[PDB]
Amino acid sequence: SPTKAIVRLREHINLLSKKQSHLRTQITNQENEARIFLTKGNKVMAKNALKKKKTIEQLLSKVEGTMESMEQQLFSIESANLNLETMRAMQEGAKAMKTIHSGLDIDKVDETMDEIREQVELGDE
Template identity: 50%
Template sequence: MKLFFGKKKETTPKDAIIGLRENLSMLEKRQAHLQNQIDQAVQTARANVTKNRKAAIAALKRKQQLEAQLDKLTASRMTLEAQAMAIEGANVNLETMKAMQKGAEALKGIHKDLSIDKVDQTMDDIRDQMDLANDISDAISRPEIFGVNLDDDELNAELEILEQEELDKQLLKAAKAPEFLPNAPTAAIHQPQPQPQRQQQQQQQQQPSTANTESEDELEELSRAMRIAS
């Protein structure tokens, strides 16, 4: 038998869902057909209810049989729909699990050659290389290579000497500054007075004071009185 028929093909979730949807579509058409027959049986019973009682009863019996078939189809359809929904949900879960498994395998492949010890060793190597690069840079930038040997102590000493010389110059300038102070009042005395003040002083010198004029008038009156009395 296996030579003629071979191994049975495994049904995939996609194929199962497609088959269920096709069966559901067929059941839906069958339900519509039965419902049309039920409606026709009802019309036949109404039409013969007064004319032909036997025909009306036969139509009602047919209606009951059709309704029984319709109920079974409805139940079968509900079962197929529930199964299709379950398969679709299971298929979604399956695809999700496959994607997660692929992600886990990818992470395993990435971390296969990695470990904490290897990472620490790599970081140590990087730090060593950076220290070596700094040492090389410092060695290249040293002035001793070009015959120039700079001593920080000598430079600081020379700088202190220059600062002391500059301080001495400032002290000498401060010591010479008071020699010009005695001439300051003389210069202030010989400063010209403002023109309005000088004119006011000249007017005061030219005009006699009021007190002197009153004294002279009193003397004249006294001498005149003495002459009259004599």
């Protein structure tokens, strides 16, 4: 069902937002480790901590892209559903209009209408 897909997409996005928060924390942690290494005079290990920070930032970007893709999919589904709702309302409205336009069991107005239409249109060819 559309509802099923929608709730699952939201659940997935929620989890990815938690992964986002976790990765941001890990990025700050790498910065922290780098500063401490520099205060120790170990530029090699500071650089190594910042290389890892860069890798984590790359993964954070991929998490963000995954979330965006799911949000777009969710929007598409919600939009399609509203379109279906409009379509069903229009078809039931059209049914009601047909019933009203055949509302006369008395007497032969529709056929006369069509006859006069064609007379009026006869000037066109």
